[PDB]
Amino acid sequence: NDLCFTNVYADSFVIRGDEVRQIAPGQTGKIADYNYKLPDDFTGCVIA
Amino acid sequence: EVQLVESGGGLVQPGGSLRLSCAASGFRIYSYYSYIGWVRRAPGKGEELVARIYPSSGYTYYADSVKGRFTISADTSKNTAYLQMNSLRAEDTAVYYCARWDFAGSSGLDYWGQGTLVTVSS
């Protein structure tokens, strides 16, 4: 809350529960690699 | 690039055993004191820690629920972590995952494999 950004983007989608762990820096897998990938240097939030 | 890659799930007869394998891709285990363990999610449960191996320190640590039956090992040339699960029971059916803890001054399991299902049934 103490960090000021010019923009914050709320990216939104639906996946299977066992693939929630793939929405992350450092991850691979059918969702992490073909549908929605986060950078290893991810400084944001993954909320599910 | 840096990832945990695993395979080796399948069907095992209770009282028997099954071995899982998780390769360290993009990094080495021994030379960086990186620790790779295993976590399982039995049907009806959330994540349960199973075991962790630290080849660089020569140690293995286990959760109370698997002590005396499961052995965690690694091959530092193949840069692969393994879980040897002996004396499996139906209650041990779970999706097993590999996970990465780096040495520290806090730390935790930030890197995860894909998971594979181990079915234990007669």
From Swiss-Prot, chain A:
Annotated region Integrin-binding motif: where? 16-18
**What's the domain of life for this entry?**
Viruses
Relate the outcome reported for changing D18N.
Answer: In strain: Omicron/BA.2, Omicron/BA.2.12.1, Omicron/BA.2.75, Omicron/BA.4, Omicron/BA.5, Omicron/BQ.1.1, Omicron/XBB.1.5, Omicron/EG.5.1; complete loss of interaction with host integrins
- In the UniProt annotation, what is the result of changing K30T? In strain: Gamma/P.1
Function of this protein?
Answer: Attaches the virion to the cell membrane by interacting with host receptor, initiating the infection. The major receptor is host ACE2. When S2/S2' has been cleaved, binding to the receptor triggers direct fusion at the cell membrane. When S2/S2' has not been cleaved, binding to the receptor results in internalization of the virus by endocytosis using host TFRC and GRM2 and leading to fusion of the virion membrane with the host endosomal membrane. Alternatively, may use NRP1/NRP2 and integrin as entry receptors.
On subunit structure and binding partners, the annotation says: Binds to host ACE2. RBD also interacts with the N-linked glycan on 'Asn-90' of ACE2. Cleavage of S generates a polybasic C-terminal sequence on S1 that binds to host Neuropilin-1 (NRP1) and Neuropilin-2 (NRP2) receptors. Interacts with host integrin alpha-5/beta-1 (ITGA5:ITGB1) and with ACE2 in complex with integrin alpha-5/beta-1 (ITGA5:ITGB1). May interact via cytoplasmic c-terminus with M protein. May interact (via N-terminus) with host bilirubin and biliverdin, thereby preventing antibody binding to the SARS-CoV-2 spike NTD via an allosteric mechanism.
Q: What is this protein called?
A: Spike protein S1
Q: Which gene encodes it?
A: S
